[PDB]
């Protein structure tokens, strides 16, 4: 018909394929009809503005709904005993008991309790009233508007940048490192020193008084003389109540380490010092590349210099600069890899060094935020490898990259894949072995014959950090070491208080159950990597198909010949790897959850005893903690867990529905749909309703994608239901 | 304290402005 | 439509031609091999994409090659 | 059978094994999951250390073989 | 399975001209399509009733359920 | 020059199943029009299940 | 010697608790039978073995956790310094000897039959004399390993190894 207008091939298709494949190729701008490099960069740049606006509108809506329908001010009076609210419910389908069930707070109606942790974050950074929130909401709506206008404007022909502007790497790196990262970090230090730290100590500072209100009793004279220490003089005491002046200090920049005793969060003056120190680093970093003033490095020169004299790396990094500068998929792959790592970092660090006031006491938000960030990191790490494969097919040219590290890595791909295959097989065999040994020992009534390997290498590292529970007396756990007795350490008393407190999750104690799961996670990381690396390294060709680059990233197969070739494309490697990634984050979040749930209830023995065999996981984790969830609605009545109950069965159903797409394949359905087309055509009256797009069965790749999407949604929705209902039921 | 019905109205009418700009940007990106 | 291409490694065994269910390929004369015939693909508007020809071909990495492309009602194998 | 036939008789009163929960409990998926799958699975998951422990091992082993498929 | 092996391997058209087996094969789109409808109908009016009950139970309206009460 | 009938060659055609492997020469064609005159036989069958293939002289190491 | 926060099983109360718990279960089962009957004798054999096993674990310098179950030490330095090398380090050497033996026997048989007329017939019908000879001559497998390594006959050269279009 007409849609999709970016593909004539698709728009001639007389079937329902046109619709589905039109939606699925709409953002792949390179493959569009008559696409030039200029037009490609300009549509990317605009879409980027569109994403920004969507993010600012999302934040604006969180602020709005919390200011309008939440209980932010009540929560501020009693953080540990009021539940924060996300939004109201306006569902005409509810009955009166459901209305009475979901009615919690003083709001007149049914609400949803929020688990995103935005209340803790807003309170920490200084907001205190619903008017604050509302004004923030309005500001963000304005910034959205600006982004959308910029998007449109830079799409106009007078402001549309040229490709050279897009390919100016050194300038971008300077600006992005000095300003985006550096000056935004310095600004945040300014916000903390001028607004947040005062509000933490009772002083109310807003736009109408900040220009007068001195953030430190001595002003900027200490700064300009060089008496910087005066800014660290009188820190808050260990008896300080957050938000009041009782026990409060005057210092604005410290290095105390550890946590504030009431909030169980990091000190704000250490967060301000942090943001200020790294600002100084990023600003210095952003003055390194050569732009328009003759000073600075050129990136190609750095690249071209680094080559080992032995020749073990070949021609080293020669030619890489044009490779990366001319390939968007390389750039996207490197970005997603980096972001992947940083997202896991945020998950691993926010539970152990909690930065927000009263957030560790909110157990369900803690569990939600860890789970959320690790699932996102998992999806992002698959993407990085996917876009690495698409680079090897679409943008890698061997003539230009001859002898450098990319061609070399491609020249020993069998060594890489075979070694990964060894590691995978080794962990899988031994780790599943040891669990099955331990299960049979428990079943035969002989728990003393389990194999329970201590994690001594992790206990050593914990000992070096200052934990004294393993009696190993090294580095920070020895009094006599250089590391401990370093005079100007000064973060150490705070740190050691924190690391030897059972309540915090700062280096949890570990034992045999911790040893087994860490090897399971290793098995999952390696096996995911192996599937994705094989994908990217066999992308351009293999022995079973030497001309794979000519078919592209995604294609069904190469037919039943040569022994059969289902799932031989690099896209299929990605599709296979997503199951392994969900399984691996599954294992990490189950471990995090069960380990915390037992620590918070006090019975760490439960985890220590039960986690060494698989019936323990099944019985004392899944089976036991599903009791309240599945009673959310019963023949007797219903409670506010009825929504999570229903979303739990919904997840089960969506996961199972995905198996239909994953197991039954296309021909079955194409032959059934032919009989339905016959029945429609031959049934009187009804025939007069004619289709415009001939009904056909979904395609081969399409159904792999639809199966994966049903599988992923059901996996996520089930676990999130279980995680929130179980944690919220018991805490 | 409680956000008033007036402040909801102002929020709505304000939101009409990035709706228009959205439409504009969409149309522009769509060839 | 799908695109069927023939490369010069053909040995003129006629097996692909025999295999094809929609008469896309035929044998034309050639001098590059002992059999003095090569395969050719004049009627690629009738190719359904089954890849039966590639299963028949006995040369090491096939001399006939089907690259799937845009769908039509003919290539989609529709009797409606 | 466990809810409506099998049980023990005292005089004329019949005390069934799951106490007649089929008639009401079977009318939702949640009830099949809760009153059948979750509740009646207590015996097999609490079988370790007993003479029924082979059923516990076969229960986990079969979950494994199914997922392997 | 074995019926399909018979059709593929041991069916002779010549010896089955206008008998029952041939007539079956002349209306095989009508047989499958009617079976298809019956399956959709039974699916919706049977598992749809459990989904009904689950949903109305969760919405707090047990008097709207397909039940003995 | 051609290999002798019965000699051993090593394939150097990268898209072939038998790359870097050794085969026996069965026949050489002498016409110049022929594009792949040498017939080689291998012990290991390929994915297609065949064990023989025609090669050019610039794809063999003899 | 108590290391890593663990107590020795010989002087752990939780260890004894576990032994009590197993023996008590066996006593309960014995109540049902008659003191002379053969089930009774079976349960006594079971209980004997059990007490023997705990005694063995007690005089082996095994280290118990808070659960009262023995824990193994796998860093070789810690194992050797505190007398726990029999838990993982000796078994390592023992596994690596037997795995090297099996590998060597398999590689040997494969390299031997590869020179036959139809080598693939000797893979589905095993040459049993040849296999027994190889199995028994391969007890000194590091001889062959270090010879092959140092000489260069272990690895095929890259030019002779089939590989894809890379
Ligand atoms: C909601 C919308 C539903 C639509 C999705 C279904 C459509 C699937 C589909 O048509 O699929 C097929 C598409 C289209 O394939 C493309 O199909 C194209 C079709 O050709 C057409 O376009 C070509 C362009 O070169 C030419 O114009 C050609 O002539 C014309 O025929 C080409 O063949 C390309 O090579 C090929 O890439 O496949 C793809 O690549 C799909 C795009 C991959 C996106 C990656 C998604 C991975 C995310 C999965 C995980 C979900 C997790 C959810 C977690 C949530 C938890 C809460
Ligand atoms: C951006 C995310 C966002 C989300 C997910 C929601 C979600 C919701 N809003 Mg809220 N809303 C938002 C922003 C958002 N809002 C903002 C910024 C304002 C201030 C202008 C409001 C003002 C508002 C009012 C007055 C009401 C709601 C209501 C609701 C609820 C029902 C849907 C509805 O009636 O809204 C209707 C939508 C609007 C009134 C304007 C929304 C403007 C946003 C930016 C929409 C665009 C979203 C996004 C960018 C589109 C991309 C998706 C696409 C990729 C598929 C639902 C929870 C109703 C409610 O509270 O029920 C209990 C209700 O009465 N919202
Ligand atoms: C910044 C991040 C980023 C960017 C800019 C891109 C950009 C792109 N990707 Mg990459 N990718 C990324 C991250 C990113 N990706 C990540 C994180 C992954 C791992 C998931 C991938 C994996 C990936 C694959 C495997 C492929 C791409 C492809 C592409 C290209 C086309 C995509 C397309 O046509 O979409 C249009 C697609 C859609 C409209 C489908 C949407 C499917 C939805 C999101 C499923 C969600 C389920 C459901 C709706 C949930 C609802 C809740 C429920 C209760 C109802 C485009 C260049 C493709 C390409 O063509 O290269 C050749 C390609 O094949 N990407
Ligand atoms: C429980 C389910 C399950 C299990 C056990 C496996 C196991 C494995 N997967 Mg598979 N996989 C699965 C689900 C599973 N997968 C699913 C759902 C998908 C998505 C389609 C995949 C997709 C997938 C891909 C793409 C890849 C794997 C690979 C692997 C191998 C990784 C090697 C290893 O980790 O340990 C070693 C082996 C095991 C732990 C399993 C062996 C089982 C026991 C230990 C063997 C002993 C049997 C015993 C003697 C009894 C004999 C039977 C008797 C009747 C005769 C391993 C064989 C990878 C691989 O092969 O890398 C080499 C690989 O690339 N998997
Ligand atoms: C971050 C989210 C986001 C962004 C920035 C874009 C951006 C774009 N989309 Mg995509 N798209 C998205 C999500 C997004 N889309 C989602 C969730 C789907 C459903 C799966 C699609 C499905 C889709 C299709 C089918 C098409 C696009 C197209 C486009 C391009 C034209 C803009 C447009 O939609 O015209 C109209 C804009 C509006 C109606 C604006 C909404 C205003 C409100 C009031 C533009 C590059 C089109 C294109 O031409 O690709 C080249 C196109 O045909 N998108
Ligand atoms: C839970 C997992 C799941 C589900 C829901 C389905 C569903 C279906 N399968 Mg699939 N299938 C599955 C797993 C599943 N399958 C698996 C694992 C495989 C093995 C690979 C298959 C292999 C398979 C084959 C080979 C066939 C089916 C067929 C069917 C269809 C049966 C007809 C039917 O009952 O439609 C009715 C739809 C349902 C019962 C789905 C749920 C619909 C809900 C209850 C209604 C949705 C709400 C709706 C909006 C409410 C409207 C009314 C209300 C307002 C009053 C149905 C769509 C058959 C088919 O298509 O024949 C016609 C068929 O031949 N399936
Ligand atoms: C694989 C990683 C690995 C790691 C993390 C460790 C870690 C450790 N080793 Mg071990 N070790 C290992 C492999 C490893 N080992 C191997 C392969 C050998 C050779 C078999 C040893 C042989 C060894 C000796 C001889 C000693 C250690 C010791 C230690 C401790 C070092 C204390 C110190 O630095 O003073 C620390 C727990 C020291 C220790 O404290 O043991 C009592 C020590 O003396 N290790
Ligand atoms: C002579 C027999 C032999 C030898 C010496 C090797 C050696 C090796 N294998 Mg191989 N392998 C073998 C048989 C052998 N394998 C067989 C029979 C299979 C099919 C199951 C495999 C499947 C296999 C896979 C999938 C992988 C290896 C890998 C490896 C390498 C690393 C070690 C390892 O992963 O062990 C693991 C070994 C197994 C999983 C197979 C068990 C081998 C049995 C126990 C011994 C041989 C049995 C044989 C019937 C003995 C008959 C001898 C008699 C007649 C005299 C190493 C080169 C890995 C690698 O590539 O490393 C880079 C790898 O991923 N092997
Ligand atoms: C008149 C009036 C009123 C009312 C109003 C209203 C009713 C409103 C509404 C409103 C609304 C209803 C709004 C909305 C909004 C929306 C928005 C704001 C959106 C956005 C979006 C976006 C941004 C998107 C994006 C995109 C996409 C998705 C694709 C591509 C393109 C783009 C990127 C653009 C009142 C009563 C007050 C008063 C009186 C007057
Ligand atoms: C395929 C492909 C691709 C992709 C890629 C990827 C996907 C990757 C990933 C990767 C990754 C994702 C990685 C990671 C890494 C990391 C690291 C390497 C780290 C390190 C660290 C360190 C070493 C540290 C240190 C330390 C510690 C540990 C502690 C203490 C302190 C300190 C600091 C000293 C691309 C795009 C290129 C393109 C082509 C193709
Ligand atoms: C059920 C099934 C069908 C039949 C399903 C078809 C034809 C799709 C019918 C979908 C209807 C129209 C509903 C679609 C609406 C979605 C709920 C929402 C889509 C919105 C984006 C296939 O074609 C198929 C093909 C290849 C492998 C497996 C399968 C397969 O399992």
Tab-separated table of N, CA, C and O in Angstrom, chain A residues 254-281:
chain	number	residue	atom	x	y	z
A	254	UNK	N	34.079	17.007	53.814
A	254	UNK	CA	34.828	16.141	54.709
A	254	UNK	C	35.309	14.904	53.972
A	254	UNK	O	35.246	14.837	52.751
A	255	UNK	N	35.910	13.994	54.734
A	255	UNK	CA	36.180	12.639	54.292
A	255	UNK	C	36.029	11.763	55.518
A	255	UNK	O	37.038	11.443	56.146
A	256	UNK	N	34.787	11.465	55.923
A	256	UNK	CA	34.567	10.742	57.176
A	256	UNK	C	34.559	9.236	56.960
A	256	UNK	O	35.024	8.491	57.827
A	257	UNK	N	34.011	8.796	55.818
A	257	UNK	CA	33.742	7.387	55.580
A	257	UNK	C	32.530	6.909	56.382
A	257	UNK	O	32.036	7.596	57.293
A	258	UNK	N	32.040	5.726	56.012
A	258	UNK	CA	30.943	5.099	56.726
A	258	UNK	C	29.638	5.876	56.592
A	258	UNK	O	29.485	6.715	55.716
A	259	UNK	N	28.719	5.608	57.510
A	259	UNK	CA	27.349	6.044	57.379
A	259	UNK	C	26.938	6.955	58.524
A	259	UNK	O	27.439	6.856	59.643
A	260	UNK	N	25.970	7.805	58.226
A	260	UNK	CA	25.317	8.625	59.213
A	260	UNK	C	24.444	7.713	60.057
A	260	UNK	O	23.642	6.954	59.529
A	261	UNK	N	24.548	7.785	61.396
A	261	UNK	CA	23.942	6.770	62.252
A	261	UNK	C	22.409	6.719	62.246
A	261	UNK	O	21.830	5.645	62.419
A	262	UNK	N	21.733	7.854	62.039
A	262	UNK	CA	20.276	7.860	62.064
A	262	UNK	C	19.701	7.401	60.724
A	262	UNK	O	18.793	6.571	60.671
A	263	UNK	N	20.236	7.965	59.643
A	263	UNK	CA	19.750	7.703	58.303
A	263	UNK	C	20.300	6.388	57.754
A	263	UNK	O	19.687	5.808	56.866
A	264	UNK	N	21.439	5.926	58.284
A	264	UNK	CA	22.107	4.729	57.803
A	264	UNK	C	22.475	4.972	56.343
A	264	UNK	O	22.378	4.092	55.491
A	265	UNK	N	22.875	6.204	56.049
A	265	UNK	CA	23.293	6.550	54.706
A	265	UNK	C	24.635	7.250	54.764
A	265	UNK	O	25.045	7.694	55.824
A	266	UNK	N	25.299	7.380	53.622
A	266	UNK	CA	26.538	8.139	53.543
A	266	UNK	C	26.295	9.576	53.991
A	266	UNK	O	25.202	10.082	53.809
A	267	UNK	N	27.325	10.222	54.534
A	267	UNK	CA	27.314	11.639	54.890
A	267	UNK	C	27.253	12.520	53.646
A	267	UNK	O	27.977	12.292	52.679
A	268	UNK	N	26.487	13.612	53.715
A	268	UNK	CA	26.347	14.485	52.555
A	268	UNK	C	27.612	15.288	52.284
A	268	UNK	O	27.937	15.534	51.126
A	269	UNK	N	28.387	15.597	53.316
A	269	UNK	CA	29.597	16.361	53.079
A	269	UNK	C	30.669	15.516	52.394
A	269	UNK	O	31.562	16.077	51.746
A	270	UNK	N	30.571	14.178	52.506
A	270	UNK	CA	31.481	13.326	51.769
A	270	UNK	C	31.014	13.212	50.329
A	270	UNK	O	31.834	13.159	49.408
A	271	UNK	N	29.702	13.265	50.124
A	271	UNK	CA	29.186	13.287	48.771
A	271	UNK	C	29.512	14.598	48.060
A	271	UNK	O	29.664	14.591	46.841
A	272	UNK	N	29.516	15.718	48.788
A	272	UNK	CA	29.931	16.958	48.195
A	272	UNK	C	31.431	16.957	47.889
A	272	UNK	O	31.825	17.402	46.812
A	273	UNK	N	32.273	16.430	48.789
A	273	UNK	CA	33.693	16.393	48.491
A	273	UNK	C	33.925	15.502	47.263
A	273	UNK	O	34.637	15.873	46.333
A	274	UNK	N	33.232	14.367	47.202
A	274	UNK	CA	33.360	13.461	46.072
A	274	UNK	C	33.077	14.169	44.749
A	274	UNK	O	33.895	14.131	43.833
A	275	UNK	N	31.929	14.823	44.651
A	275	UNK	CA	31.528	15.472	43.415
A	275	UNK	C	32.495	16.590	43.043
A	275	UNK	O	32.781	16.765	41.867
A	276	UNK	N	33.064	17.270	44.025
A	276	UNK	CA	34.026	18.330	43.750
A	276	UNK	C	35.393	17.801	43.280
A	276	UNK	O	36.030	18.383	42.414
A	277	UNK	N	35.890	16.731	43.905
A	277	UNK	CA	37.152	16.142	43.502
A	277	UNK	C	37.038	15.576	42.103
A	277	UNK	O	37.889	15.892	41.281
A	278	UNK	N	35.986	14.812	41.800
A	278	UNK	CA	35.940	14.249	40.468
A	278	UNK	C	35.662	15.352	39.457
A	278	UNK	O	36.012	15.202	38.302
A	279	UNK	N	35.091	16.474	39.869
A	279	UNK	CA	34.866	17.526	38.889
A	279	UNK	C	36.219	18.003	38.427
A	279	UNK	O	36.449	18.217	37.246
A	280	UNK	N	37.120	18.133	39.378
A	280	UNK	CA	38.426	18.650	39.046
A	280	UNK	C	39.147	17.671	38.135
A	280	UNK	O	39.844	18.070	37.217
A	281	UNK	N	38.962	16.387	38.352
A	281	UNK	CA	39.576	15.433	37.457
A	281	UNK	C	38.960	15.531	36.063
A	281	UNK	O	39.688	15.621	35.092
